[PDB]
Structure formats: C-alpha cells, structure tokens
Design a protein around this ligand. Structure first.
Ligand SMILES: [Fe+3]
Length: 279
C-alpha cells in the first residue's frame, strides 16, 4: 500500500495534482447514467453536483419526521454514536443510521442515489459513514475548509479518491444560515497539510476555481461532492435551522486499509470496515 497522497508528514504544505479519475465510467457511456451529460460534465468540472427536487414532497416530510422521531426515541441512550451538547445534553448528531435503523437503511439504499454514485465511481459501492446532523437555529459553529479525503486517507486508510459524499438537506438551505460552501474544481488538487489547509493554498484553489460555490434550495435538495472537494461553512447566527442527513459512498474497489498516518483505526461508526455478509 504505497501512499499516493502523503500528508501531515512534512512541515511544509504542498499542492499535488489528482492521481485518480473523477468520473470512473467512460464518458462514452454517458447514455447509461441516470443524469444528463450536462450534470456529468458539471460534476467533473466542479467536484460537486446539486440536485434540487431529488425527492418528492411527501418523501421530504417523511424524512424530516423520521429524524425527529429517532432523536426522541434515543433520548435516554448512552452511546458514542450519539453526539450530545454538554450542558443541555441535546442530541446534535447520530452516526451509523444506515446500518442501525431500518428507515435510514432504506434511504441509504435508495436506487436514485445508488444509480448515480455507482456510475460516477464506476463500481459497486458500500457506505463508509452516515450521520444525521441536528442544527437548530443559532447553533453549530464555523467549520474551516477541509478535504474529507485528506482525513479518510490519513486517519482511516482510504487509499484513493474514489468516494462521494451525499448531503440531503432536511431544512431549507439559504445563503445566510451557514450553508455548506465548496471551492469548485478543488477536487483536482490534493493539499498536503503539515488537516485544515492554510490560507495560501486556499487562495490558490479559489483563484483556480474562479470563486466559491454555495448551493441553496428547499429541504430535500441534494448535494453530492467528491471525496477531495474542499468545503466548509460559517456559523449560523439566524433562526433558520440546518438539519441534514449525510452519507458517504465508497467504491468496493477502495476499501480501507490501515491508517496512512500509521496510527490506530477509528471506530466503525466513523469509518466502516465491515464487508457486507453474503446472507
Ligand atoms: Fe467535511
């Protein structure tokens, strides 16, 4: 397992080009994809794709009800998968719902999602991680810019950029309430950290990308983004919440090995190492 993407090793950051395809299925096979050529081109160029109206209105309502019924059902639970705010003990995240809850397993297995990620990753996929995020109005701090791939590689042993994050908005997504922002085109550049990149690198990626992208849309809208697309968000100082369901689809050809940091494995609810049993 040669490290094609060393990071946190050198005390000096460096930008290296991408060594992996972005769209793994041949573009001559676009006809076979569940999304158009324009969508495919836009994913490839930008490192993300927003799809508004992915889910019907009843499905959105249902998912919104479901995350709050689950939150209530687990109020008394003691579990490292359940992230709570100290003081209020309010639940802010629940990991691994894709496996631990029937409803959310079905969402994670939604054919609409699987058909896209399988085409983009040019193989079958499995869920690397899932989480429900509860972000009430006025809650949730800033998250500095980062590449998920950098973390998955160094800390979880993901060898190659062959995963896709899928974010389902379960609250209306506005410009002003701390939405997810992304640097378009940044997926094509690996920023080796000395894992939050420095201002100079971010300036360089922004310049190349031409700007900053901020998908917005009503609850139910979906944003897919490539493993190495740089993203981040401001705090929310508004009463508009930002609840979401987040899943990561990894290619079955890119299963985790030991962390490239040389460090210990993180828990299964953070990074899946189970292989699906045949039964
Ligand atoms: Fe992230």
């Amino acid at each position: 397992m040669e490290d094609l993407y060393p990071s946190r090793q050198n005390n000096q950051p460096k930008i290296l080009k991408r060594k992996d395809p972005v769209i793994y299925t041949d573009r001559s096979k676009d006809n076979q994809a569940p999304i158009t050529k324009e969508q495919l081109d836009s994913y490839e160029k930008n490192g993300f794709l927003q799809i508004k109206n992915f889910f019907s209105e009843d499905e959105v309502i249902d998912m919104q009800k479901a995350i709050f019924e689950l939150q209530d059902s687990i109020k008394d639970v003691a579990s490292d998968k359940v992230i709570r705010e100290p003081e209020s003990n309010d639940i802010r995240s629940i990991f691994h719902v894709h496996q631990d809850d029937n409803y959310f397993q079905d969402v994670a297995n939604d054919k609409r999602i699987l058909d896209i990620v399988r085409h983009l990753l040019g193989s079958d996929v499995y869920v690397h991680q899932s989480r429900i995020n509860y972000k009430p109005g006025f809650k949730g701090k800033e998250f500095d810019w980062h590449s998920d791939f950098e973390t998955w590689h160094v800390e979880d042993g993901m060898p190659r950029m062959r995963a896709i994050s899928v974010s389902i908005a379960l609250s209306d997504n506005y410009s002003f309430n701390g939405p997810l922002m992304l640097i378009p085109g940044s997926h094509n550049y690996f920023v080796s950290c000395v894992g939050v990149p420095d201002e100079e690198s971010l300036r360089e990626l922004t310049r190349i990308g031409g700007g900053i992208s901020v998908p917005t849309g009503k609850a139910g809208s979906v944003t897919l983004f490539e493993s190495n697309t740089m993203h981040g968000s401001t705090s929310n100082i508004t009463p508009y919440p930002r609840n979401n369901l987040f899943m990561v689809y990894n290619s079955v050809k890119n299963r985790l090995v030991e962390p490239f940091s040389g460090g210990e494995k993180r828990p299964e609810y953070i990074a899946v190492r189970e292989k699906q049993p045949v039964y």
